[PDB]
């Protein structure tokens, strides 16, 4: 039967409409908040870099500079020239690149040989040259400071201070996206962290930010038969469940669970203190929308049958309750439903082998991101709380540099909506469109992202305004909240998994406990890989390897098991900083002041363990990298897809005759399309190999020495694939 989602994804002019006014008032003075445009400032710094290349040629001091920063300069110049559309300007870059080549070929014969092996491999040789620690050396900004001897504008200074960590941050849109996508490939040893003069810098979040600022404002349009748009009739609760008082098994919080001769549960959920009937009716109709479209959506959770929604006198409720006794009035609207007992076992429960846990976790993350494509967001899967935790917090505020201290982490996923059955209790839904518009949800929890960017550094006494690149996020804030929802889903998974781990390893064989925690590490990475596949289509196997290029599975295993169980509290403060080196192999130890509560660990309330010191980072650092790796792989793959298709039309207009140009250019239009294919995605290069052969049909005239080799390796790879395909 038909199987598709009821949401179409597109783009819109601007997310910054009906937002709060861009103004920061403080000490009675209202300061306007102004955008520093990303691409405009970016281009100013690249032309300044270009002039600086020219003042380096005139200085005739190319020997004074190490051989592999003329390799960086030349390779970037060649890459930039290829990215340039019109011939007149790409020749003014090759003007600048030729003295660097003349010198390298004459005074550095070996480096010249290595560089040319890259120039015939790719049209953007700089992105593969920088698939390693070379990326941490900012050759562009170094040259700018040395030869552009004139002070930067207030915004080049702003752009520089924000994106100081790598020259890739100044690359034009295609070169940066291509570099960022391929920096997860198997040859690439790049990881966004370098060690400074004894200090360690992490800039995984900057990769995401520098990507997001080049994106266009997304927007989701819901089908007219969508759950939030289709006019639904009244609820026909024509039957009333007869509440016996011995059929009730249990009472899981304003919900009473009743037994049945069919070994499943009829549950009856009672009105909260502050709660309208609307909410319980929405939960009813959600359960029906799920049921109706369960095949249509390939939803895997066990879905409850909504039985009835009606009102019940509070006397009867309180009468049929005894044993563990948030209801308010003498009349209480009710939502009664039928569901397996799996629906009421929280996914973090000790009584699951890790065969059932993995199976049930896989169920949850599938329906979480399938329903996201469907356009439905569950913003309260867990109570990780105004002070509501932000998974991707450095991209949403100006101040924070790392992710905050999760408070009472085990209590957050306590009544998590994730069960052995799968997704559960889906009443508190939110339309995905609410994240891309100025809804009540967004201006409450994300008011800075929607107002935008005050800090004293930003303030310009001359102007009277506070200027920052942050205020640019007003036109794109929906894109930020989209990615944050993705990371938020996977962090609730992680706390749920860690909760299970703590309660299973407690009262246990040290090898048996350690082996459990590394399986928990694997199911977490497997979960993120699943998300990437549901969101992009990348084979989950490859999504996993792309992920493990960036996130260290084994570092994550050993900081999860160390911080989410209380054994470290029984250590004195200074055998503890002997153990931290084992879990932060190169990275700095996790510094913290707080006094440890014995048997608990770090605990502000002295009863419940937290993740992090009182006003510190969360100590789960490679978890933080995991989420950004996940979220960047998604958004990065989608931008690469867009640049792929944007260039795909170019080669198709040249091919058809709609754009006349030379032979030697039509082939480099096609070869450029090769560079925007996804990493590890073969059919994309099968498609451009087809374009290559058609171009040789169009231009038999043309010599093809520059692209024969790079397109042979695609041809030989495709031939080898199909002989391996003959496994019979």
Partner 1 sequence: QLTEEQIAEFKEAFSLFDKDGDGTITTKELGTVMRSLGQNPTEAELQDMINEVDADGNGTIDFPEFLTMMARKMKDTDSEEEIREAFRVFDKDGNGYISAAELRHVMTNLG
Tell me which of Cl ion, partner 1, none is bound by residue 684, counting a contact when its beta carbon lies within the kind-specific cut-off of 5 to 8 angstroms: partner 1
With CB under 8 A as the contact rule, which of the stretches 120-128, 382-390, 586-594, 675-683 interacts with partner 1? 675-683
> Which of 5, 203, 343, 525 lies at the binding interface for partner 1 (CB under 8 A)?
5
Give the up-direction half-sphere exposure of residue 680: CA atoms within 13 A in the CB hemisphere.
20
Neighbours of 704 (CB within 10 A): 16
224 binds partner 1 (CB under 8 A): no
- Interface stretch with partner 1, choices 61-69, 568-576, 584-592, 679-687 (CB under 8 A): 679-687
The one-character DSSP state at 596 is P
Decide the pairing of beta strands 465-468 and 459-460.
antiparallel
Please, which residues have CB within 8 angstroms of residue 641's CB and are 6 or more apart in sequence?
678
Q: Which two tokens stand for residue 204?
A: 């995984």
| Shortest spacing between CB 673 and partner 1, in angstroms | 12
User: CA separation (Å) from 281 to 211, 382, 423, 571, 604?
Assistant: 41, 22, 19, 52, 39
CB of 544 to partner 1, least distance (A): 13
Cβ-based nearer residue to partner 1, 402 or 540: 540
Residue 392 interacts with Cl ion (CB under 5 A): yes or no: no
**Complex with partner 1: residue 515 or 720, whichever CB lies closer:** 720
Q: Supply the DSSP symbol for 248.
A: E
Binding site partner of 401, from Cl ion, partner 1, none, Cβ cut-off 5-8 A by kind: none
User: Which positions from 335 through 394 interact with partner 1, judged by CB under 8 A?
Assistant: 373
Q: Which does 614 bind (CB under 5 to 8 A by kind): Cl ion, partner 1, none?
A: none
Nearer to partner 1, 630 or 684 (CB): 684
What are the φ and ψ backbone dihedral angles of 320, each rounded to 5 degrees?
-80, 20
Q: Closest separation between CB of residue 565 and partner 1, Å?
A: 38
Give whichever of 220 and 334 is closer to partner 1, judged by the CB atom.
Answer: 220
* Partner whose binding site includes residue 660, from partner 1, Cl ion, none (CB under 5 to 8 Å by kind): none
Positions in 696-715 near partner 1 (CB under 8 A): 715
CA distances from 601 to 254, 308, 350, 598, 617 (A): 32, 46, 21, 6, 15
Q: Is the dihedral of CA 135, 137, 141, 146 positive or negative?
A: negative
Closest of 238, 242, 182 to residue 207, by C-alpha: 182
* Closer to partner 1 by Cβ: residue 160 or 670: 670
Contacted entry of partner 1, Cl ion, none for residue 2, CB cut-off 5 to 8 Å set by kind = partner 1
- Identify the residue among 50, 94, 105, 142 touching Cl ion (CB under 5 A): 142
Name the minimum Å distance from CB 140 to Cl ion: 9
Query: Which residues are CB-contacts of 35 (< 8 A; sequence separation ≥ 6)?
Result: 452, 467, 468, 469, 471, 472, 474, 475
Our CB check for partner 1 shows the closer of 9 and 570 to be 9
Q: Based on CB atoms, which residue is closest to partner 1, 146 or 652? A: 652
**Residue 639 backbone phi and psi in degrees, to 5:** -70, -40
724 binds, among Cl ion, partner 1, none (CB under 5 to 8 A by kind): partner 1
Residue 8 or residue 322: which is nearer to partner 1 going by CB?
8
Q: Is 425 annotated to bind ligand?
A: yes
Q: Which one of residues 71, 81, 119, 143 is an interface residue with Cl ion (CB under 5 A)?
A: 143
At closest approach, how far in Å is the CB of 392 from partner 1? 22
Tokens 């011995």 belong to which residue? 246
Residue 143 interaction partner, one of partner 1, Cl ion, none, beta carbon < 5-8 Å per kind: Cl ion
Piece of 21-29, 231-239, 279-287, 683-691 that binds partner 1 (CB under 8 A): 683-691
- Assign residue 601 a region: left if phi > 0, alpha if psi is -120 to 50, beta otherwise? left
Of residues 52 and 549, the one with the C-beta less far from Cl ion:
52
Task: At 245, list the tokens.
Answer: 């008082």
Q: After which residues is the chain broken (C to N over 2.5 A)?
A: 325, 385, 508
Residue 240 binds which one of Cl ion, partner 1, none, with CB within 5 to 8 A depending on kind?
A: none
Q: Which of 124, 346, 409, 470 binds Cl ion (CB under 5 A)?
A: 470
Positions 490 through 549 that interact with partner 1 (CB under 8 A): 536-539
Sign of CA dihedral 457, 463, 467, 471: positive
Which tokens sit at 465?
Answer: 């305004």
Q: How distant is the alpha carbon of residue 78 from its chain centre?
A: 31
Q: Among residues 65 and 372, whose Cβ is nearest to partner 1? A: 372
Binds Cl ion (CB under 5 A): choice among 100, 140, 267, 469: 469
Cross-strand pairs, 628: none
Residue from 108, 641, 643, 675 touching partner 1 (CB under 8 A): that is 641
| 255 to 294: interface string for Cl ion, x by CB under 5 A | ----------------------------------------
Residues 6 or more apart whose CB falls under 8 angstroms from that of 723 comprise none
Q: By CB under 5 A, is residue 130 in contact with Cl ion?
A: no
Angle between helices 621-656 and 682-698 (to 10 degrees): 20
SS3 93: helix
Q: What's the token pair of residue 53? A: 């290349």
Q: Which residue matches tokens 């669970």?
A: 257
Residue 121 binding partner 1, by CB under 8 A:
no
Query: What letter does residue 188 receive in the DSSP assignment?
Result: -
Pair of tokens at residue 704: 């093809």
For partner 1, the binding residue among 40, 232, 645, 646 (CB under 8 A) is 645
Give me the least distance between CB of 643 and partner 1, in Å please: 13
Q: Residues near 153 by Cβ (< 8 Å), separated by ≥ 6?
A: 41, 44
- Picking from 14, 51, 58, 55, the residue whose alpha carbon sits closest to that of residue 35 is 14
Under the criterion CB under 8 A, does residue 719 sit at the interface with partner 1? yes
Rounded CA gap, 275 and 286, in Å?
A: 17
- The verdict on whether residue 356 carries a ligand-binding annotation is no
Q: Name the minimum Å distance from CB 485 to partner 1.
A: 16
Q: Tokens in use for 224? A: 């007219």
Q: Which does 415 bind (CB under 5 to 8 A by kind): partner 1, Cl ion, none?
A: none
d(CA 598, CA 176): 49
Angle at 145 between CA 141 and CA 150, to 5 degrees: 130
Candidate ranges 153-161, 170-178, 462-470, 608-616; the one touching Cl ion (CB under 5 A)? 462-470
Residue whose CB is less far from partner 1, 56 or 528: 528
Residue 566 sits at the vertex; the CA angle it makes with 560 and 568, to the nearest 5 degrees, is 85
Residues of the shown chain interacting with Cl ion in the complex, contacts defined by CB under 5 A: 142-143, 146, 469-470
Residues tagged in the binding site annotation for Mg(2+): 425, 428
Residues of the shown chain interacting with partner 1 in the complex, contacts defined by CB under 8 A: 1-10, 373, 536-539, 641, 645, 678, 681-684, 686-687, 690, 715-726
């Amino acid at each position: 039967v038909k199987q598709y989602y009821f949401a179409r994804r597109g783009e819109t002019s601007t997310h910054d409409t009906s937002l709060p006014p861009p103004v920061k008032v403080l000490s009675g003075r209202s300061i306007p908040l102004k955008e520093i445009p990303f691409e405009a400032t970016r281009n100013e710094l690249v032309q300044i870099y270009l002039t600086s290349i020219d003042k380096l040629i005139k200085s005739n001091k190319l020997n004074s500079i190490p051989s592999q920063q003329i390799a960086s300069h030349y390779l970037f110049l060649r890459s930039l020239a290829n990215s340039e559309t019109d011939g007149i300007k790409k020749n003014q870059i090759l003007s600048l690149a030729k003295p660097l080549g003349t010198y390298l070929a004459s005074k550095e014969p070996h480096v010249w040989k290595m560089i040319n092996e890259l120039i015939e491999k790719s049209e953007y040789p700089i992105i593969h040259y920088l698939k390693n620690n070379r990326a941490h050396s900012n050759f562009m900004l170094a040259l700018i400071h040395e030869y552009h001897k004139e002070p930067l504008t207030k915004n080049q200074s702003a752009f520089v201070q924000k994106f100081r960590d790598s020259s890739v941050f100044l690359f034009p849109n295609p070169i940066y996206t291509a570099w960022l996508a391929h920096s997860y490939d198997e040859d690439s040893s790049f990881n966004p962290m370098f060690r400074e003069r004894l200090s360690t810098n992490f800039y995984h979040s900057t990769l995401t930010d520098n990507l997001l600022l080049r994106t266009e404002p997304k927007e989701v349009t819901l089908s007219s038969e969508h759950h939030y748009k289709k006019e639904k009739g009244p609820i026909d609760s024509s039957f009333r469940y007869q509440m016996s008082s011995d059929r009730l098994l249990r009472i899981q919080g304003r919900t009473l669970l009743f037994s049945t001769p069919q070994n499943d549960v009829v549950a009856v959920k009672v009105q909260k203190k502050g709660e309208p009937k609307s909410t319980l009716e929405e939960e009813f109709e959600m359960a029906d929308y799920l049921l109706k479209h369960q095949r249509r959506l390939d939803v895997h959770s066990k879905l409850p049958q909504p039985l009835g929604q009606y009102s019940v006198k509070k006397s009867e409720i309180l009468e049929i309750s005894r044993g563990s006794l948030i209801d308010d009035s003498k009349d209480l609207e009710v939502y009664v439903y039928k569901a397996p007992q799996s629906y009421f076992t929280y996914l973090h429960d000790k009584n699951q082998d890790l065969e059932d846990l993995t199976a049930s976790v896989k169920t949850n993350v599938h329906d979480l991101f399938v329903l996201l494509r469907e356009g439905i967001v569950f913003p309260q899967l867990a109570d990780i709380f105004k002070g509501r935790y932000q998974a991707l917090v450095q991209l949403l505020n100006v101040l924070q540099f790392q992710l905050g201290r999760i408070d009472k982490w085990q209590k957050a996923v306590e009544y998590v909506n994730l069960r052995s059955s799968g997704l559960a209790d889906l009443g508190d839904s939110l339309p995905i469109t609410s994240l891309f518009t100025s809804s009540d949800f967004t201006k409450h929890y994300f008011s800075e992202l929607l107002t935008g960017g005050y800090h004293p550094t930003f303030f310009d006494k001359s102007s009277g305004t506070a200027n920052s690149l942050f205020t640019g996020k007003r036109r794109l804030f929906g894109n930020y909240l989209y990615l944050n929802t993705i990371a938020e889903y996977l962090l609730v998974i992680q706390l749920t998994l860690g909760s299970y781990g703590d309660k299973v390893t407690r009262d246990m064989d040290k090898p048996k406990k350690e082996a459990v925690w590394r399986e928990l590490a694997n199911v977490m990475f497997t979960s993120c890989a699943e998300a990437i596949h549901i969101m992009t289509g990348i084979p989950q196997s490859r999504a996993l390897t792309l992920l493990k290029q960036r996130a260290n599975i084994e570092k994550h295993f050993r900081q999860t098991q160390f911080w989410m169980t209380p054994d470290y509290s029984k250590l004195d403060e200074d055998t503890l900083q002997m153990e931290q080196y084992s879990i932060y192999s190169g990275e700095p130890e996790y510094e913290f002041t707080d006094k440890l509560v014995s048997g608990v660990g770090l605990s502000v309330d002295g009863v419940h363990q937290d993740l992090g010191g009182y006003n510190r980072e969360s100590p789960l650092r490679e978890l933080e990298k995991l989420l950004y790796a996940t979220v960047t792989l998604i958004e990065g793959t989608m931008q690469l897809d867009k640049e792929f298709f944007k260039q795909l039309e170019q080669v198709e207009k040249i091919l058809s005759g709609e754009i006349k140009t030379d032979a030697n250019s039509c082939f480099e239009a096609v070869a450029q399309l090769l560079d925007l294919a996804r990493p590890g995605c073969h059919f994309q290069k099968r498609l451009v190999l087809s374009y290559y052969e058609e171009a040789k049909l169009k231009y038999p005239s043309a010599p093809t020495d520059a692209y024969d080799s790079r397109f042979q390796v695609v041809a030989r790879t495709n031939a080898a694939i199909t002989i391996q395909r003959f496994w019979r």
